[PDB]
């Protein structure tokens, strides 16, 4: 399973199991460019989030309820949804994912 693999590699589940995790299959430039797009509030209230104009190719990785460290199972779900990230700093760049419209 892609999730078990990527998650494993990226050190996302090499010392704990992460419930959720979205991987974007678009160029980093394109993704970073989102920081100058539709400005909306994040779930945390703060209004420094920017929804993508278009839909990106993604992969929702969910931990199935039956798994426990050191064995983290992941349900892979491919999709094409708008992303919403929280940009901060200079250069303004994505530092938090937030949702997939």
């Amino acid at each position: 399973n892609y999730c078990n693999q990527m998650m494993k590699s990226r050190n996302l589940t090499k010392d704990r199991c992460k419930p959720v995790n979205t991987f974007v299959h678009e160029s980093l430039a394109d993704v970073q460019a989102v920081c100058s797009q539709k400005n909306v509030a994040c779930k945390n209230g703060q209004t420094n989030c920017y929804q993508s104009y278009s839909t990106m190719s993604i992969t929702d990785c969910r931990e199935t309820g039956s798994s426990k460290y050191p064995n983290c199972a992941y349900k892979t779900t491919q999709a094409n949804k708008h992303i919403i990230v929280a940009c901060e700093g200079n250069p303004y760049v994505p530092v938090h994912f937030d949702a997939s419209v």
Partner: peptide, 15 residues
């Protein structure tokens, strides 16, 4: 070591 914007790239980015 690993900035906030760097950690994003590693955790989510998979161009």
């Amino acid at each position: 070591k690993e900035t906030a914007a760097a950690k994003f790239e590693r955790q989510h980015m998979d161009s």
